[PDB]
Amino acid sequence: NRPNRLIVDEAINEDNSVVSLSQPKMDELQLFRGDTVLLKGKKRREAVCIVLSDDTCSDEKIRMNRVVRNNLRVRLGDVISIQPCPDVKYGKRIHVLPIDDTVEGITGNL
Amino acid sequence: NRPNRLIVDEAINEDNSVVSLSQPKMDELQLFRGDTVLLKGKKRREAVCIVLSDDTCSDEKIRMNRVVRNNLRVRLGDVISIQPCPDVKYGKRIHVLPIDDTVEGITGNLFEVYLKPYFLEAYRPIRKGDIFLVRGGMRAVEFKVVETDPSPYCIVAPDTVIHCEGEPIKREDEEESLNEVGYDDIGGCRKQLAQIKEMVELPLRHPALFKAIGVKPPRGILLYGPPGTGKTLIARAVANETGAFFFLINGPEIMSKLAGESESNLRKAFEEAEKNAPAIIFIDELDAIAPKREKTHGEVERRIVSQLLTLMDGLKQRAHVIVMAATNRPNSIDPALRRFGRFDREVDIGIPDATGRLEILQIHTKNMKLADDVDLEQVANETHGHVGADLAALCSEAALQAIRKKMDLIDLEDETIDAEVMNSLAVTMDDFRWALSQSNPSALRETVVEVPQVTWEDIGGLEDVKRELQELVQYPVEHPDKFLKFGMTPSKGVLFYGPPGCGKTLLAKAIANECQANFISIKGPELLTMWFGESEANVREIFDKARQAAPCVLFFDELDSIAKARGGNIGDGGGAADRVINQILTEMDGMSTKKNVFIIGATNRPDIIDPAILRPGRLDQLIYIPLPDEKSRVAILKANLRKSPVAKDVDLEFLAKMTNGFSGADLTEICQRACKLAIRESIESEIRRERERQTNPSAMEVEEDDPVPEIRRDHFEEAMRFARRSVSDNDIRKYEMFAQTLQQSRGFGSFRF
Amino acid sequence: FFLINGPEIMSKLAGESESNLRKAFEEAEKNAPAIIFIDELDAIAPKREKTHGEVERRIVSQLLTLMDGLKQRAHVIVMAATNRPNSIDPALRRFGRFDREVDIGIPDATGRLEILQIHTKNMKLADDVDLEQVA
Questions:
Q1: C-alpha dihedral, C10 to C15 to C16 to C20, nearest 10°
Q2: Does C52 touch chain B (CB under 8 A)?
Q3: Which residue of B lies nearest to C26 if distances are taken between CA atoms?
Q4: How far is Cα A51 from Cα A60, in angstroms, rounded to an integer?
Q5: How does B657-667 read in b/e, with b if 16+ C-beta sit within 10 Å?
Q6: How far is CA B671 from CA B132, B645, B652, B674, in A?
Q7: Given an 8 Å threshold on Cβ–Cβ distance, is B416 in contact with A84?
Q8: What are the chain B neighbours of C52 within 8 Å (beta carbons)?
Q9: What angle (nearest 5°) sits at the alpha carbon of residue B241, between those of residues B236 and B246?
């Protein structure tokens, strides 16, 4: 990518929870309704939020959401480029373990 | 083997696993359908191959295919017949373990794809390197290990599934076997390996060769390998060729504070290895591991010696076990030199070679390196001044550093692997050499003036001397056969007795430049000591280095001053000097090794030389050096200037005319002074500092010329007026005149019949 | 992932410490495990620094074997302060660091300023804290 780095400011949308998917995500890539722009993270972390977006209504060039930035731990102004990632695996069935901290300290059956 | 060489031609069948048998094997191998035709091959080879022999048409050549040689691990022309399957042992629970390569790439589970071939017949070649054709699955269901777990054809019907081990092991045994050191990895010493291995095998293959001969195999001998010889490579090669449990035993590791604890541990290890297998013990650092309890009063050392004489010299304590004593140096007079019981028998084993440095470098480059641009001539030139496994490590380091420089010069290339950068990563001979110079020690790089690019370039002239030295070198280099035909041996050294410091050191440098190895610079100062033992030590070091390397010019300073033809001076000094003179004569005489050696004595006073040394053979060539000449001075000054500087204003003819035959050392001093004056007067040293980027970066918009331009005749004249150039003409003239008068008194007539 | 560790539960591990270390060194040579930093690396491996007997020399020799017996896939070797500075383990004496040094940055005002910034982010030092003065 580019050799000079920059910093990403706040999202253009006023609402943090309103993270509109970019038009380029559905244009360059076949972004379906059930998938969004998958964010890459550190130590093999990846998260995608299922949100319906309308690329034909308004292509808002807003920055990442505060919750999205905190969850993905995305650096400020990091070059968002698609490169070869050979460290991604896949599975069929998993066990969604609950948070142990929420179980303890809650009155009654947490 | 047989005296008729087997013709290694193309096999009749295209497939490597299928070969055509010879005339005698056309009907010798019975074709049975219910019983697999297991051909008796190498390394317990029980292969169910076809009996397809092309001998019914013509005499099929007895030769393996391209992959069959690596598959069967059998030599060309080896006799292979249809015999009982030795690799196929039927047992109570004989199941073949699976491997990751058998699991990876195959559809479904490894057991699921294997049971199709594990039910009655595999219908595939179960061997390492063989062309294994597996019908169906589009994959090879076989263990990526040395061989099958239970057997090649075990007793396992379809009701007995292949019970795999706890984990699928793949690409592990093959990696070790590739890493197993081939005996050829060391040039010349592979003869030693063959000698020892044949001693083991033939005495075992032929018990007549051991008992009926009456000579048993030797328990062990001192390793004729110098320090850092990579004797670990020797042990690895022994283990790879001769299958045994290598027992590396570091001498330092055998040093313990508790008396006997190291000895008891060593005895326990020896016993454990003996009970383990016909193993091989590697006594690392064995030469310094003990003082033989003679030089040292250490009771621990005595106990270690006793344990060795008990453990190493044990009653049949080597059940086909090899006590390989890894001596620190091949010639180190070690404890076992004092106690020749560990080497109670030294095997006649062919020692290493000289291009084995170049050969090992070529092997390392051919091992996995893709340095195509690395010139083999540069490799040979480096191997001329290099080491054994140490030089191989230096080559590996140079390759790694050049590859790092190239890869760092490239980006991460995460998207796609750059085939040109990665594959065929031709590390340039320049790149590899620079990486080596950055990696390998730089002390030996400038020490050999063969690296210094002055073939009498620093001192123009001495063409007769240069020619004589070149002829002497090329004699047992170019036409040693001519020397044998004449039957004349070379001379010892040259007594270049001329002006002091006129370039005698430069003379030695030029000689080394003509040479390929290093030299031996000595001074009379090192000879003096309060206790008279320095001369023997110096002579021993000189002999060992000459015994070690090629002719090292014994550039001895104050040689005449040290010797002074004995004379018999008073005091302890006179007797010590006489003893030193006798020791020097003994070093220059006696049952010498007749190895490559050269002598360069510094004698500013020929009258102060030794009378005994003056004898031919004691100094051999007593070629008294001349003094500098005006034309010679002009040539030397021109060459010295031509090295660094270019000057048009300062005329070389004017410099020569002003020189009037000044001293060659004085000429070099004048050149250095003019160079310093030019460097100080340099605009980059003067003008750039003057402006210092105040209004302009330098005091001039354009840079000045080369520093020599223009250090005119004024700067040189000022230096010369400051310079002495004051050699004692009368004294040197008298010395040369006396030498010439002696030489004239020494000459004779033609006396030709 | 994969190849978590050996059992290594005897709490004594006389020769077992060497055995598990050799097993981990050999296992990573054909696997893709992470470089898990050795806890108490100097304590478990005296590295010719603790005793003039056998434990420290054995630790040094095992380090040399592991550095000369592991492929470039995990390289679980402690850096900087691996063993004691006086006698570090032979992981650098064997293959891996025998020809290259470490481009360590000297202790300058940059490190002090970065530490001060980290501390200020962690806790409120002062309203007018002179981080330049501290550096």
A1: 150
A2: yes
A3: B172
A4: 15
A5: eebebbbbbbb
A6: 76, 10, 12, 5
A7: yes
A8: 257
A9: 40
Q: What is the resolution of this structure in A?
A: 6.1
What does the block give as tokens for A20?
Answer: 């509109």
Which residues, 6 or more positions from B432, have their beta carbon under 8 angstroms from its beta carbon?
A: B371, B374, B378, B395, B398, B399, B402
Longest dimension (CA), chain A: 56
Q: Residues before each break in chain A (C–N > 2.5 Å)?
A: none
CA B71 to chain C, closest CA, distance in angstroms equals: 24
d(CA B363, CA B388): 13
Q: Which residue has the tokens 């400011």?
A: A9
Alpha helices (runs of H) in B413-554, residue ranges in sequence order:
419-422, 429-439, 443-447, 463-474, 480-486, 504-514, 534-548
Give Cα B197 distance to the centre of its chain: 23
Tallying the residues shown for chain A, one arrives at 110
8-state DSSP, C9: -
d(CA B266, CA B276): 15
Q: Which residues of C touch B256 (CB under 8 A)?
A: 53-54
For residue B505, with 0-12 CB atoms within 10 Å meaning exposed, 13-18 middle and 19 or more buried, which class applies?
A: middle
Phi, psi (degrees; rounded to nearest 5) at B208: -65, -40
Cβ-based neighbour number of residue B561 at 10 Å = 17
**Is residue C73 within 8 angstroms of chain B, CB to CB?**
no
Which residues are CB-neighbours of B223 under 8 A, at least 6 positions away? B229, B231, B234, B286, B324, B325, B326, B327, B330
Which residue matches tokens 């083999």?
A: B376
Name the maximum alpha-carbon separation found in chain B: 111
Tally of CB atoms within 10 A around B736? 18
Q: Is B721 on the interface with C (CB under 8 A)?
A: no
What letter represents residue B638's amino acid?
Answer: K
Q: What is the DSSP string of B732-748?
A: HHHHHHHHHHHHHHH--
Rounded distance, CA B250 to CA C61, Å? 10
CA B651 to chain centre: 49
CA distances, B362 to each of B371, B375, B400, B423 (Å): 11, 10, 16, 18
Handedness of CA B397, B399, B405, B408 (dihedral sign): negative
In terms of Cα–Cα distance, which of B250, B285, B436, B238 is closest to C64?
Answer: B250
Strand partners, B598: B553
β-sheet bridge partners, residue A39:
A47
Among B167, B256, B264, B394, the strongest candidate for a mutation testing the C interface, having the largest count of C CBs within 10 A, is B256
CA of B106, closest CA in chain A: separation in Å?
Answer: 19
Angle ∠(B476,B482,B484) on CA atoms, nearest 5: 80
Comparing CB atoms, the residue among C30, C53, C99 nearest residue B256 is C53
Residue B708, burial from CB neighbour count under 10 angstroms (0-12, 13-18, 19+) = buried
Question: How many angstroms separate the CA atoms of C20 and B424, rounded?
Answer: 39
CA dist., res. B439 & res. B462, Å (int): 37
The residue of chain B nearest to residue C100, with distances taken between CA atoms, is B439
Query: Which H helix or E strand runs over B365?
Result: helix B356-367
CB-based contacts of B133-139 (< 8 A; 24+ apart in sequence): B133/B17, B137/B106, B137/B107, B137/B113, B138/B107, B139/B105, B139/B106, B139/B107, B139/B113
- Bridge partners (DSSP) of residue B706 are none
Among B226, B233, B228, CA closest to B185: B233
Question: Is residue A46 within a helix (H) or strand (E), and if so which, with residue range?
Answer: strand A45-47
Beta bridge partners of B324: B282
In the block, which residue shows the tokens 């190498």?
A: B42
Chain-centre distance of CA A49, in angstroms? 6
Contacts of A83 in chain B (CB under 8 A): 414-415
